[PDB]
Write a protein that binds this ligand. Sequence first.
Ligand code: ADP
Ligand code: ADP
Ligand code: ADP
Ligand code: ADP
Ligand code: ADP
Ligand code: MG
Ligand code: MG
Ligand code: MG
Ligand code: MG
Lengths: 550, 48, 191, 50, 520, 535
Amino acid sequence: MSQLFNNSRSDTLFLGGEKISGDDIRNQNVLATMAVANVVKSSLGPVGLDKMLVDDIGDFTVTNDGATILSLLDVQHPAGKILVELAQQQDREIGDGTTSVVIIASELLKRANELVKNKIHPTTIITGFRVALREAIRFINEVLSTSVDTLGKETLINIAKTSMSSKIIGADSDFFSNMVVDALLAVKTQNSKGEIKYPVKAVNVLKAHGKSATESLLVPGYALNCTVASQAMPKRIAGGNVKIACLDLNLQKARMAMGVQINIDDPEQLEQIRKREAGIVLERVKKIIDAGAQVVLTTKGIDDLCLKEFVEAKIMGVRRCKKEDLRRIARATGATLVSSMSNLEGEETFESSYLGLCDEVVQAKFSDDECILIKGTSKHSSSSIILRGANDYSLDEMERSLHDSLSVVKRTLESGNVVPGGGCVEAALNIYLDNFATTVGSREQLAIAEFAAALLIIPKTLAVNAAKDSSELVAKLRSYHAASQMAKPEDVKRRSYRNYGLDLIRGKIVDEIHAGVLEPTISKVKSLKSALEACVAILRIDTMITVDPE
Amino acid sequence: KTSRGEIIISNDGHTILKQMAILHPVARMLVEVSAAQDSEAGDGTTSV
Amino acid sequence: AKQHENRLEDKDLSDLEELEDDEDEDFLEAYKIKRLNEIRKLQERSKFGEVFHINKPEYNKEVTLASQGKKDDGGVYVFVHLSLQSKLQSRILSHLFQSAACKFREIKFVEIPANRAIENYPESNCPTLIVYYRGEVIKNMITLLELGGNNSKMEDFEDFMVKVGAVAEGDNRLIMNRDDEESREERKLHY
Amino acid sequence: ILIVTSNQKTTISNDGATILKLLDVVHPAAKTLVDISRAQDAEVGDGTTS
Amino acid sequence: VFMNASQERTTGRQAQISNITAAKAVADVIRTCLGPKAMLKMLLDPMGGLVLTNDGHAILREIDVAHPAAKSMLELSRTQDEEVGDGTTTVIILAGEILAQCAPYLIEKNIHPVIIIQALKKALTDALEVIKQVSKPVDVENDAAMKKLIQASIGTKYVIHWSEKMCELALDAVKTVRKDFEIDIKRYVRVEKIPGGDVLDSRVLKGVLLNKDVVHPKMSRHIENPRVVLLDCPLEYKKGESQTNIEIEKEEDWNRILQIEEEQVQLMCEQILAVRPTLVITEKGVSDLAQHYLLKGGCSVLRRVKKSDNNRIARVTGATIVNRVEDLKESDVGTNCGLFKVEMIGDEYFSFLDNCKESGLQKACTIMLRGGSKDILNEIDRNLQDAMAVARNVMLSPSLSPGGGATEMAVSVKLAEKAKQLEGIQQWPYQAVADAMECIPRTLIQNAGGDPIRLLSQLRAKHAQGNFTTGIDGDKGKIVDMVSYGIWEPEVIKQQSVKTAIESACLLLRVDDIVSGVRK
Amino acid sequence: MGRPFIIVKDQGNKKRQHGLEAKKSHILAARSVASIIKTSLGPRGLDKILISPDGEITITNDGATILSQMELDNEIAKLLVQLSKSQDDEIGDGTTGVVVLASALLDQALELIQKGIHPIKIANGFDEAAKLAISKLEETCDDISASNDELFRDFLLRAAKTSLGSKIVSKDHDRFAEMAVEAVINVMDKDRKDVDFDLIKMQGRVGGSISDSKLINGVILDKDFSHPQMPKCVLPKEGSDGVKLAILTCPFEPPKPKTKHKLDISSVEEYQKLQTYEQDKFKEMIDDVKKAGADVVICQWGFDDEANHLLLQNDLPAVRWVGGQELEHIAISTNGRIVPRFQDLSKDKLGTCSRIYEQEFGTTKDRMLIIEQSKETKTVTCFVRGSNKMIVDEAERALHDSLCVVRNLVKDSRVVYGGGAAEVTMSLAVSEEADKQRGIDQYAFRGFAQALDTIPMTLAENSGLDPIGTLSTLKSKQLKEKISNIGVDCLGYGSNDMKELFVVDPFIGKKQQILLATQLCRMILKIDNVIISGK
Ligand SMILES: Nc1ncnc2c1ncn2[C@@H]1O[C@H](COP(=O)(O)OP(=O)(O)O)[C@@H](O)[C@H]1O
Ligand SMILES: Nc1ncnc2c1ncn2[C@@H]1O[C@H](COP(=O)(O)OP(=O)(O)O)[C@@H](O)[C@H]1O
Ligand SMILES: Nc1ncnc2c1ncn2[C@@H]1O[C@H](COP(=O)(O)OP(=O)(O)O)[C@@H](O)[C@H]1O
Ligand SMILES: Nc1ncnc2c1ncn2[C@@H]1O[C@H](COP(=O)(O)OP(=O)(O)O)[C@@H](O)[C@H]1O
Ligand SMILES: Nc1ncnc2c1ncn2[C@@H]1O[C@H](COP(=O)(O)OP(=O)(O)O)[C@@H](O)[C@H]1O
Ligand SMILES: [Mg+2]
Ligand SMILES: [Mg+2]
Ligand SMILES: [Mg+2]
Ligand SMILES: [Mg+2]
């Protein structure tokens, strides 16, 4: 919208870029926000559709998440970098509402810039949003609903369908909702003296393009993507109570430390020195072979000198891997990760307590790949996810989609209270805040009124993505909600309305309880606060100063 | 926006004047006055 | 490419009739109507044809107004001659004006004594040739040493008129392009 | 509003009739405001800015 | 300006139009590469080689398209090759049609790209049902039917004339790699090539085939019962993991240092002669001093052998991978070796290792190829991968689906009949699934030169009345039932074709915009 | 939206400005233009050197001549070029004062723009202050029309010496001021007087010194006679002292029509006849002039050769090639009228002159005629000299400014007394009304008061006197005493009363300084958007 660039000024000489002031900055900041808001506006909801981004080397990424699509969009403008880092803050903390928090912040900066043109100060505008948000969080506490009289895991299933939607695997949500809920119940633990927590990225994802997403097999146990050391080893260990030994010790032709320089006068010492230098590693592996470790795990590789005894003793070897995956194998099998084998006494040894326990271990072939599937752990249960698709780009889409689905159900179990979805929260907060500040009167009624209209952009964005009549749904949403808030406490039917709203598939008003649309209360909590601080950071900017690079 | 890739928001007049690279030396003296006001008093760096 | 253009471009209305039996009628008569219209424009523009022996009050009109013409920017070139009967080059240039006046009727040929033109003009600088066009002086020419001097010919004067934009290069009236009939007769026999 | 075209001739004005005439508009949608301003200037002669 | 984008944003309906046109363009390149009368394709890579083939996977490996929607179609061939190993062109040609038929609706009747996805999963669920019903089981131990099953894919290749030998070649190789569930893998299937010779004398031989000869001339070139022992370390004197740095003071030390270099190689050689092997295969290089005293005992020394071949030798001879020589015993020594012999070929020497043939570890083998040139070898080698891939599916799944487009045509008829009873908004994309499934017989009729108008009309008239095994004869171009025609394919290839083709459409249909040139 | 975003052509060269900072450059740009000409104000001023692109050089102190023919970039300074010019064309004086006074209003208005008052409201305060200032000056204005012509003759010297005092011509202000006054005595009608400025010509010759300049009554010609053997000085004889100057449009030439024509010449009979035709024409020509009794004949175009000798025989000199614009001015002074043709020539339409002479100027090969008249005639022509080309141009412009200053006295006899007396008188008038009418525009009245004080402070700055003692003395004295003709004495006299110092200015001249300044600054303040298309 800005034209006729600002003139280079001779009275104000600053090194680097030229200074520019006035309303053009907030116009340029909003224009920079629309450059990123229009990108994420189309990929919202189930009816929303996403786009592709090439990496200039033939590779590309078809992305639904707001954090991923903005991470690859390196925004040179300063105001856009705030929203880019906000989505990186949003997905790491909560893992939900990454698209809505950017859309809420864009609509706020739109109407906030319109209010600044209406000649009210931004300080009064910010005070209007904070008092409104403090009442909004108070209203979110009123509309909570505790799960009760529900048969089995139905509340965890249908709430996952809301997060599973807006993806390619939303059609298969009936199949993935069971295994996703069963996966998080398998990695349950105890911490902080009774506080229930689950670990971050505990469930694995293995990229095996193949049969289909419908036939994704839930292996009740841990899975690891590693190649066999020697191909002569057995790929299936029979018999129960298989002992797993987790290590981080190297079994190779080891070298002496840096500050050792061997110097000998006798020629015959080279025979013993060359054998003892290799034989010092044999003392480490001879003790663990006698302990009966059927399958050894290690971070650092194993050279061919020590792979003979494993082939002769029928022991499975493991090559390089990540440091974090072996920690959870030790927790599930009951082993202990040893950085360096030793003992408190003056002699080296290896105890039996360091060994794990599992029922069965086998190397399954996922159509080109060697992966050691562990199942039936004794100490703590575990789980893994076998993703399957048409091509590798879809598997990458399935990775972050499950990461969002796992994150939503993770925060669902932290707090039993839930809130409905489908724009009912935004539709109720609109009418609730319009009624608010009528007694206040003078100045903050216009600021809070436009704030209430800013939250309506989400049910408007979901409608146009469906390519349907949007105002017909907005007339039903707001009116129904209003007729519910005004109503007597004693009116069952009307009160219920407070509970339902927009539907994107059939295009009519139906109940969310029977439909199954549901979200956590934590997803809306601290989402508007992040959008509020995002609006405050750009709205308070008057002039822009740019220094050229040296 | 500084020369390097760092971005910083600033209401403080001392940090505004510090990050702004001024070509005129007399106007550059106000950067040191705000540094002096910041070191001695620590309040009212723009009022001076 | 030029072989197709030479049929029409390199033939006047009198020469275009040669291709009446060979070329198509619609191809030929379409261009003859175009060339016929151009001939009619030159007849309407033929407002001159003899040397206008003028005097000064009039200069402020004949030399300059004419140069504006219609003011359709109908400009008109006006060749002035500051004559001086004592000089030998002046009488030569006066003969070239009357010879060119009979041919180029669209261009105005003006003559006046040099003593009556400018107050106390240098006699050594005479004869002087000025060329007006739309009120602006296109060329302030000095004595005819550039055009051969005493040995100036009609061919040299016609070549100067092409340089100032007064006559086209491929005009059939110029002696450079107006080949003799005996010359073209020998070309057809030896072809 | 002070406008200076490419020919370097100063032209100060208050009404929007001649301001839009000086600025040669390329965009067709922005020419709609210029056409009504000249039409309002030609018919009535007031309210060209409003 | 703003961020590195907004060059020319293809948004709205025109973006999806380019993807359907781009996805259709990939199938048009290999439209003629289907059926028994399929044409070959010579692609020119920029390095300097050449790829002569008709397989859609090998064609699409070498091609390079600068478009992101077509690259997702490019990756589907790797899904089919690294899952079964047959029907890669079938996957690419079917999806093109699915994206194309769904297009009319997307462009005009405005059905949103999510309602089409819901229609396809119910079509996918019904497709597996009718494919399960149309397929008939078959006995796995019947060698007469197994040869006809293996040569179904060979018929669409150049070596159909040698199909009597290739089925015997592939059947013996698959049973060797097959482990007694019934899991097999092609990493031990050696693809060693020999330029020149006739295809008739080419045969599989139990064991390995090296490219090297013996080192010393006195080594026995013909051993009755070889006893192979694998070594990983070199026979050279190991310098050690740390520097020696011997401080020499007396004159009798340097000759001692050079003498222990001779005695250490004696010590490792003498303990190898405790079991008295005939052939010692070392992974790393060998020294000149050590080979003589191994010959004094009667061994045979070779050059450095890469351990990809030593792992095959370990399963053939039954030996184990051994690096420490001090722990060498008599139990880990390879035995039951058939014969040892070295032939003379002008390219390089070739050492043969035959097996006695008489549970345990799975046995490996090497398949001899005697082609006409280098490209003929690579052409025939890919045919074995396509032919041996068929043999795995019948063992993993005893089901057997009819070929010749009868399976996909059966999907077309049932989806078309059931589309009338599926009244609603899902009826239009559900009925469009049958329009593409009837194209994979249409491509066979076009390559055969017949008119697909009356043939498909005659096909649907006889498919409901005659039988479920009706199909088109690709050579003659007439309707011939698959029972009398005697050519059948596995049902697993039909599953991956329907699953991968529909699942590819669900990904590409969700594409809204295309923005190129963001960053690396 | 795409990466291109175009609405008008050539957006790269066009750049807008807006906000308070955009207006800040405009007033500060006027300070640079004002500060250049700030030192040239008053009698102690210093000239400016100008250089054209063609290499022609000139020197001057007039604000309109300085700002004119100068290469500028900013548009606001070009408005000041048109300002000074405005005062010059109409008034011809006050070109530096109106620019300095306009900049003073802008400098005082910036402080107020800085407080939060709208710019149009500031200009409304100056309008009520300006009308009250000029109304108060009109109240304390003295009229000199009641006096007779003798005392009124002296008042022209008091004002002519003022404007000539601020130039380089002031080495003899008593001498050259008579030249500016005596020229207007010959054109005034003595009742409902009009200047008739077009009759008064002005020409200066580069040569000699400025002290040799003497006023004449006639027309100065820059051309020689038709033949050099004619007598230089021509006197009258026994009766009819007027020389009977005959003026002609058509020269001595053969008669012929304008249109193109060819005279058909027959056999030898017609060839010999036409020789007698033109030979009898010249005999008829010389008899016609001698019948009229003319002594000097001038034509706009040159006579034929034979014709140059035929006039020389009868003692009948002639000048030739007299410019067409110059020919009309000769007839007015001589009380004659130009004949269209020679057949209408008679005694009544001939001229009248006292004496003429051909004046030589050193070794140069040029001739100038100097017509003189013994009695009071209609027109008058200045005769300026100097030792340089630019000093004659400076003397012509200094005399032209004084000629326009006395021109205002003829059409309007109500005069004032400037030099800081009118400014301090008008400054305290609005200040005394500011605290009576506090309102919100009191700061605009105070800004208008302090803006008027910059002029006498500039005169105090250029004269070296202390502005503190000078400004405090005028404010304290003028508030006490009602006499309003005390100002800043720049020449260093002991008394500041201007009754004795012989300084007078016109009311129309001092009024236009405030009107054109306050009316321009309204336009300068109303600019918000500033678009400058780069060339
Ligand atoms: N099946 C559904 N029915 C109604 N609304 C839905 C459904 N699925 C998702 N939504 C709505 O779409 C919005 C965005 O969902 P989603 O795209 O999964 O999250 P994000 O905004 O983090 O990408 C949510 O606020 C939710 O209310
Ligand atoms: N709540 C308030 N109401 C009115 N004026 C205030 C308030 N708080 C501060 N001020 C005024 O505003 C000024 C703020 O100065 P400040 O911005 O703190 O300087 P700096 O940021 O350089 O320390 C103070 O000088 C004070 O007079
Ligand atoms: N004396 C007044 N009182 C109130 N409003 C006025 C007055 N004069 C003008 N206006 C308002 O100012 C607006 C703009 O008028 P103006 O810009 O001067 O005319 P135009 O837009 O035709 O150039 C009009 O809409 C009018 O209502
Ligand atoms: N002899 C044949 N007659 C008719 N159709 C055939 C014949 N052989 C193969 N087909 C058809 O060609 C398709 C692909 O077979 P094939 O060429 O073996 O695989 P690929 O497409 O990988 O080369 C099969 O779906 C089958 O229906
Ligand atoms: N001798 C003097 N004594 C007192 N005041 C003088 C004298 N000469 C000039 N002034 C004052 O100085 C001012 C100078 O004006 P001037 O510079 O001649 O006009 P401009 O500024 O247009 O060039 C006059 O208005 C007059 O009031
Ligand atoms: Mg989501
Ligand atoms: Mg108006
Ligand atoms: Mg095949
Ligand atoms: Mg003056």
